[PDB]
Design a protein around this ligand. Structure first.
Ligand SMILES: Cc1cc2nc3c(=O)[nH]c(=O)nc-3n(C[C@H](O)[C@H](O)[C@H](O)COP(=O)(O)OP(=O)(O)OC[C@H]3O[C@@H](n4cnc5c(N)ncnc54)[C@H](O)[C@@H]3O)c2cc1C
Ligand SMILES: [Cl-]
Length: 488
């Protein structure tokens, strides 16, 4: 008889899940599995992101229970767990969604070898990306496009991505009873307290497929907003109602299918002939993700500077004091510090808020390596995504993809154009809540009488600025110019 495992890693959803559909086909028993390394922390990861994963697993558990089944959260390393459960459960087929990250390729090769030793068929459909990204490279002559313009031309020659797969059946084949490795007490979803976090998550975005689909429907309630979306024109200071979809955490974990999102976009576009086009359109945003997955997966050492063939070698400074001030939201520039507080509190900030703080750290003011900023984002972002974090940090530091290092955002002026009253600053830096708007982006310029009346004395309640932007940005531009000459 057929006994199958559907192994979740990403792809934390029932919709558009061809791996799950294959596992269920003609099966007597299906074992839905997630493998949790219970020593992960004792090795880097904020409770915000880890709890988002746990909420996503709890949602899957509820969905499987509604269909007569159960999610099994196995503790250990895949290479140690799977040989045991292959034999225990009489497994004949293992299904999982393909993953192109570096660690995944090593892990999955090991599991494939073990499956073959046990006589287990392995099925690995592509559904985390819009397309088979190896197919895109092949149809481009064997190399990934290195500009968005050429990437968009390639996908348009290839055509539409595959349609989302059908929903799974209303009843699933359950795990077999009295299998020791499937014991309830050994296979439940843990809480954040149980995995060892001491402080609670503070983010406002809840994990899981159910929430992902609800947020998708909310975005599409206004088709004119979807059709006319232009990413560069959206407001980074909007926090009560964010100005973009905030689907990124859901896409990162696969709670939302990218193919479903794309299909829904095309439905709207067919009815709105003046809809925006790539790169600025909402379809364009999914193509930025696809572009960076395609380049990233075919480039060695993509997450590093040294040994990375697409990355310019730049003389970044090893300045721990500047990195600490940035990481701890005590730069003395309220726009920067508010965004860095949103990072640690919510784990998500608007794209142009990410631009502001990444420019400041690297080529704009402090001249610290983008790899250090990437590490801080990797800890705190609930949408942390290996290829997308690396690629956008290389863009913002003018190390790859982007080369216009004379464009430097002002940490004072940039936010003021959207939010002159500083509502965003006041929300995330309440020490400044009573500062008059005239000084809230530049509090060190307020007279002492004003600082005292506001209960915010610079140097006592809120730090002085760690640099003078005019001085620092001129120095950084000169160094970038010199670095660009050296790589001639
Ligand atoms: C320094 C830096 C680091 C970043 N790190 C990450 C990261 O770890 N994870 C991440 O998902 N995005 C990252 N981004 C890209 C981008 O800022 C986010 O995808 C975006 O803020 C998510 O908001 P949203 O879902 O509302 O996006 P929308 O504008 O609604 O876009 C829809 C989807 O398109 C994709 N997308 C949008 N913008 C980009 C982009 N510039 N690059 C790649 N894909 C994009 C995402 O999957 C996103 O959910 C980073 C950008 C910068 C400047
Ligand atoms: Cl600016």
């Amino acid at each position: 008889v057929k006994n199958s495992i559907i192994w979740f890693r990403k792809g934390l959803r029932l919709h558009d899940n061809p791996a799950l559909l294959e596992a269920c086909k003609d099966a007597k028993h299906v074992y839905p599995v997630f493998v949790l390394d219970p020593h992960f922390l004792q090795q880097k990861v904020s409770v915000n992101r880890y709890n988002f994963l746990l909420e996503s697993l709890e949602d899957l558990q509820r969905s499987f229970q509604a269909r007569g089944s159960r999610l099994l959260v196995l503790r250990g390393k895949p290479e140690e767990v799977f040989p045991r459960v292959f034999r225990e459960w009489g497994v004949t087929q293992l299904c999982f969604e393909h993953d192109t990250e570096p660690y995944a390729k090593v892990r999955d090769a090991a599991v494939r070898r073990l499956a073959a030793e046990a006589g287990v068929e392995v099925v690995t459909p592509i559904s985390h990306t819009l397309y088979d990204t190896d197919m895109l490279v092949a149809r481009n002559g064997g190399a990934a496009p290195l500009t968005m313009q050429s990437f968009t031309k390639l996908v348009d020659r290839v055509g539409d991505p595959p349609a989302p797969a059908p929903d799974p059946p209303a009843a699933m084949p359950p795990p077999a009873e009295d299998m020791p490795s499937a014991a309830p007490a050994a296979t439940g979803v843990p809480t954040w307290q149980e995995v060892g976090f001491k402080e609670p998550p503070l983010t406002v975005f809840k994990g899981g497929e159910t929430e992902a689909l609800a947020r998708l429907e909310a975005a599409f309630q206004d088709p004119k907003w979807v059709a006319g979306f232009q990413k560069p024109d959206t407001d980074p200071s909007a926090w009560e109602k964010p100005a973009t979809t905030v689907l990124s955490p859901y896409l990162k974990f696969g709670c939302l299918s990218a193919r479903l999102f794309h299909a829904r976009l095309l439905e709207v576009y067919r009815r709105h002939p003046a809809h925006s086009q790539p790169p600025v359109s909402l379809r364009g945003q999914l193509l930025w993700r696809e572009f960076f997955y395609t380049v990233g997966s075919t480039t060695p050492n993509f997450h590093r500077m040294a040994g990375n063939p697409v990355c310019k070698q730049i003389d970044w400074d090893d300045n721990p004091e500047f990195l600490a001030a940035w990481r701890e939201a005590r730069t003395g520039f309220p726009w920067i510090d508010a965004i860095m507080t949103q990072l640690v509190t919510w784990g998500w900030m608007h794209h142009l808020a990410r631009h502001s703080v990444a420019c400041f750290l690297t080529r704009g003011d402090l001249y610290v390596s983008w790899e250090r900023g990437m590490e801080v984002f990797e800890e705190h972002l609930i949408d942390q995504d290996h290829y997308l974090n690396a690629a956008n940090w290389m863009w913002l530091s003018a190390s790859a993809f982007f080369s216009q290092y004379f464009r430097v955002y002002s940490p004072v002026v940039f936010g003021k154009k959207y939010d002159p009253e500083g509502r965003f600053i006041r929300k995330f830096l309440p020490v400044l809540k009573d500062m008059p708007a005239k000084y809230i982006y530049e509090p060190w310029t307020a007279p002492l009488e004003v600082q005292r009346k506001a209960g915010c004395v610079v140097g006592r309640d809120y730090p002085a600025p760690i640099v003078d932007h005019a001085v620092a940005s001129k120095a950084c531009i000169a160094r970038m110019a010199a670095a660009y000459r050296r790589s001639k």
